[PDB]
């Protein structure tokens, strides 16, 4: 007797049986040709689980197999928080080639306990119109499934065949209104979501994406070429592990898109045209002077190690991106997929190509500074090398930001806007030293070390509850030191020094009060905002000093100052829309849903890139032009401030 | 009829049966109390597999279960290279708590083919004296198993219970003489080597180590505290995937050690005593002069960004080490485990603490240079800031090498000996400029950029077959440029310039010939050897120039030069023993078996650290002392070379 064979009718949805001690139940269901493409779920439940609360390990084992696919159920399934005494798994359906020939569904029940167990078997079939949904007609590139129910007892599965449907690139988006944790699972059609193929695998081809409100997966050309067929599953997650008592019903809307390679010619051309016409301010003055007109002692003492942090970070990020599998790239990278336009394997090509303004303006800065060089009695001190450094850091900002947008994740060094802080500090150094000497680029050494150290410190303490107090202390110390240096350099000449100190203290204290007690300022924005505000304040102080020392600001310099102020404000408005936070769960990071503002290509972050580049350009032009009224004044009669 | 039940005797080892089309075989074996702790293997074989060469997917499915554990067999199992029609898996044995009560072993056979299949079942029991071997008596800390057979049909498994055996720290070593690929697998005793627990796991607690000649796993205190029980398996690997036709027999010897926390007081004290007594050369001269005896203008223009590459690499490595699981740390890190002494979670504490000589000597360099400062008419030009830079890079070398030995892997930047190259270049700069001016530390900028770029370039092209030609081209270009600079600076004064150029060309060409056509020079050593050799050649040239210009080298400086030459040679001899190569397989990297040379604590690499630090110290002292015969000579009458 130990082995008991039962015959189960197809109509049966629920089976209740008692497993006598040391006995095995074998249940058979015959499958005809009506079971083709029928995705079946079999679940097992232990009746009266309270009696087995003192037993460790597996209390019931169930095996399910239809001949083509199989899995094992081990009850209870244990989770970090809970223990479930009911669980089930999906069986890959039989195909038309499988079919008086018939197929069998076999269920085996075993236990290690020397006591009778009551148990329940649930055989549920999924909606065969959510399976095989992914079939595209001629001229059809998008399909939508709206208001689909998701339950712990009824998951959702799709079959995708790219070879048969003529698909080279595929995108999938899920939308939900509730905050119920779910999972999006993808495997190649010949892989199992439950088992390992062999015991040495170390192959990562399975995607597991926890989500609440939004999930995105992109099948690139390379991945489709490798595998050609995929299965997609959605499950209710029993434990809110990657997101933050069940019986929830969760509604999900799907969006499936076939994609082709796209050359975003119109948006790129419009961006280049918009970025180019600002450069016409360089033509009438800087270039015309060039038209009208030891190097090794500065080439080997120029600080070139300032480029090392960005270049090493770029090498590290490229190494991390290239060795990752296709499946892991959708798990580890976080984009704003509502405004992400792909190009090849790159998920957000807009966020990368919109950094070209920094590259264009940095090279222009370098070339113009080198050419404009060339006298020692009249005018302010020239600033060739530090302007070259400002251009170099513009180029470094373009490289660092483009590298960041390949795969935005939580790493040791964020590196999306530190070069902007360096640029602001360098402009402050320029205006601080231009009337005493030729400004040196070793203040770049000190500034870069400070900026990178602050970036790392903010990153390391972000999870804690006192990181902003550390930032406020460092901010206070830096501003106090700068005020002390101003005092010592100029002396306590009432009008000049005292108002500078008071205004800088008030502005920085207002900022400190703001980001300490607002919570609308994210950690990734505080340092950049502080550097920009301090740079603008110092430039305004320099201009007011020029005015009240009875000097004249040229109308060209007033125009450039106004344009710089406007561009900085617009860039800051678009920067405020960032909303990036690595302290929340992956599902919360995936819930970002801001669409592209312009031409379906440009979003808030893309515009922040372009307008930050413009603000940098206009500020550079303003500081280049502001002291052009003193070109014939003698260096000994030039006022000092 | 479709379900057929068979009763199988315990004596049966082989079963041959025909699976008629659309039929299911259920085989039962009753288990008495004699099956306690009996690790059982069940394998399935498809007879005449040639008939199913045109069929895709799974042709036979087998489920095995003893009530407590279960698995699934799907035939054929496919591998990157081969397809196996015979495969089996291990079943976790029944325990004493499981036991007229009896247990059952159940085997189910199914197929999707509408044709009869012949198949064979093999039920093999493993050696129950290799299972439960890990039981330690009182006063016993090591156990050894010698000459154990490993076959594709008979794997090896061990059960480890740390709670019952009173184990806080455990080490396992495997030795083999043949090059047959195998796998070492470890899981917590409540985890499966075959299945995922739930479908959202992303938990890495399973170790898979490919090996040929040696494998090591270390159970730290933290891991044992989390899990308390583990199962260890060895398998023949069907495909030589992580290593480089079967029926091989592979012999393996095991070594199991209980470990306790150790304070290596005697070796550390001896190392500190050995490192300290060299410093007595500083006492009679440099410190006695201090006893007998703008800063902000150099503090803000000092290049501090030179510390950024090492500090950022250290932050990245610490982030990578801390977020890794216990299981992954044994998979991703490669030590010389024959000479690795643990401390806490650190696998090789000797390789980390032996870098303290660099830290001790760099701080001494900095302090002595700062204090010895302080005149402008007599003697050679003083070198305070560049000596401070040399000390700073000594400290950076200690940090970088200690960080490297936490987890030696194949990363973008190796960073075990670039700071040594920087130190050699800085000494060359010191001797190049000391008789013309005070040497500047911006040559550090150019030198550091070059060194880091060369390191990255060697790393990126290591897999290719022409990396050494790229290195040779860069070497030729650098040496030619240096010779040209020497010519231009000194002029073609026959005796001085021509012999310098000829000797440097000959030495560097000999080196280039060597590492191009020897293959005993590894990629990771070429640049370091070149920098050391060029530094020594330039110091010898400087000394010979002093001698042939009728100047005198003090006996103290001759002693320091001799000690520097001896220490560099000893350090190079120990450096030659490195044998690190990231182009080979992981098994080949794990086959390293060099034991500790001294006190069971110091190996070749540990001695390379100490003697490289000594060589640096002696070279620094020599260049500090060599021009002490010119202290009263006037700067205008000092010879130039
Ligand atoms: C470890 C964690 C990170 C730590 C660092 C974190 C911060 C990193 C940032 C910066 C690090 C460096 C800042 C400067 C340091 C003081 C230098 C100084 O005052 O002396 C110089 C002043 O020269 C200037 O002040 C020039 C302009 C500097 C602007 C750079 C900071 C911008 C403020 C950012 C806003 C706040 C930051 C936002 C915070 C959220 C020279 O003085 P002197 O006496 O004229 O020179 C002698 C010559 N003389 C006597 C003949 C004239
Ligand atoms: C992209 C891939 C990596 C590329 C970089 C890879 C290499 C990176 C390494 C180094 C990069 C920098 C090297 C120096 C470059 C030339 C500088 C020069 O000649 O001019 C200076 C010479 O001054 C010296 O030569 C000082 C000593 C320099 C030693 C540093 C290199 C050691 C050789 C390593 C052995 C070979 C390397 C081993 C290869 C396996 C100054 O010249 P001057 O004219 O006196 O100054 C003007 C003032 N005066 C006219 C008034 C006097
Ligand atoms: C020169 C200035 C404006 C900056 C460089 C921008 C130009 C040269 C870049 C930016 C966008 C680029 C294109 C982006 C997309 C396409 C389509 C596809 O086939 C890949 C390459 C191709 C054809 C690129 C060619 C080069 C390209 C046009
Ligand atoms: C400087 C300002 C005024 C204009 C600069 C010209 C820019 C906008 C031009 C120069 C080269 C051009 C590209 C040349 C080639 C490609 C690839 C092609 O498959 C689609 C068009 C596309 C993508 C063009 C886009 C526009 C482009 C980038
Ligand atoms: C921030 C940078 C880029 C822009 C600088 C803009 C310059 C041109 C602006 C900004 C602040 C301005 C000053 C603000 C207030 C006053 C007081 C009053 O007496 C009128 C002139 C005067 C003194 C302004 C002169 C022009 C001024 C200095
Ligand atoms: C020249 C710049 C850098 C200095 C001042 C920055 C200004 C322009 C920025 C910084 C903070 C920004 C504000 C932050 C919050 C709000 C509230 C909400 O309605 C969104 C926009 C709005 C109203 C922003 C408008 C622009 C803003 C005021
Ligand atoms: C001061 C100079 C010589 C360098 C510093 C070396 C000394 C201070 C270091 C190096 C080795 C270190 C010890 C290494 C091992 C032990 C045993 C264990 O309980 C952890 C800490 C402890 C107790 C450390 C204490 C500090 C220690 C003794
Ligand atoms: C400078 C030379 C001459 C001697 C320097 C003294 C060194 C060797 C001394 C100073 C502090 C000492 C350590 C102090 C504390 C510890 C932890 C203890 O559990 C074992 C001994 C151990 C690990 C000592 C090892 C030797 C030690 C590192
Ligand atoms: C490499 C550094 C650290 C050590 C330098 C060692 C010095 C003291 C050594 C190394 C090479 C030596 C020279 C080698 C050969 C000769 C030729 C002959 O006429 C004797 C003296 C003379 C000229 C030696 C003088 C001392 C010398 C300059
Ligand atoms: C002062 C230093 C840096 C310059 C010269 C380095 C010398 C001392 C080093 C570099 C290469 C080394 C040799 C490399 C290979 C061999 C062959 C084998 O039997 C091991 C040791 C031996 C014999 C080494 C002895 C020491 C050695 C000759
Ligand atoms: C299934 C489908 O719609 N896609 C097409 C199919 O219609 C077409 O006939 C075939 C050859 O063009 O390529 C694919
Ligand atoms: C199994 C074994 O040897 N280890 C010891 C056991 O003997 C000992 O009695 C117990 C209490 O000390 O700790 C454990
Ligand atoms: Zn950005
Ligand atoms: Zn080392």
Numbering used by the authors:
A (entry chain A), B (entry chain B): 33 to 131, 144 to 288, 295 to 343, 425 to 505, 510 to 776
Reproduce the article's own wording on this structure:
The SID-1 family protein is a putative dsRNA channel or transporter that plays essential roles in diverse physiological processes, including systemic RNA interference, uptake and transfer of microRNA molecules, DNA and RNA autophagy, and antiviral innate immune response. The Caenorhabditis elegans SID1 gene encodes a 776-amino acid protein with a signal peptide (residues 1–17), two β-strand rich domains (BRDs), a cytoplasmic domain (CTD) located between TM1 and TM2, and a TMD with eleven transmembrane segments. Akin to the structure of hSIDT2 (26), cSID1 also adopts a dimeric assembly through an extensive dimer interface that involved both the extracellular domain (ECD) and transmembrane domain (TMD). A Zn2+-dependent catalytic center is formed by three histidine residues (H740 and H744 in TM11 and H540 in TM4), S533 in TM4, and D551 in TM5, this H3-S-D motif is highly conserved among the CREST (ACER, progesterone adipoQ receptor (PAQR) receptor, Per1, SID1, and TMEM8) superfamily.
To achieve a better understanding of cSID1 recognition by dsRNA, we determined the cryo-EM structures of the apo-cSID1 and its complex with a 50-bp dsRNA. The apo-cSID1, cSID1-dsRNA without symmetry (C1), and cSID1-dsRNA with C2 symmetry (C2) structures were determined at overall resolutions of 2.21, 2.35 and 2.21 Å, respectively. The 2.21 Å EM maps display excellent main chain connectivity and side chain densities of cSID1. In addition, two cholesterol-shaped lipids were inserted into the hydrophobic cleft formed by transmembrane helix (TM) 9 and TM10. Another two cholesterol-shaped lipids were positioned adjacent to the TM1 and TM3. Intriguingly, a POPC-shaped lipid was buried into the hydrophobic cavity formed by TM6-9. Interestingly, a POPC-shaped lipid was discovered in the hydrophobic cavity formed by TM6–9 and two cholesterol-shaped lipids were buried into the hydrophobic cleft formed by TM9–TM10 in this study, raising the possibility that POPC and cholesterol play significant roles in controlling the lipid hydrolytic activity of cSID1. Compared to the structure of apo-cSID1, three regions in the binding interfaces display dramatical conformational alterations whereas other regions of cSID1 remain unchanged. The cSID1 exhibits no conformational changes upon binding dsRNA, with the exception of a few binding surfaces.
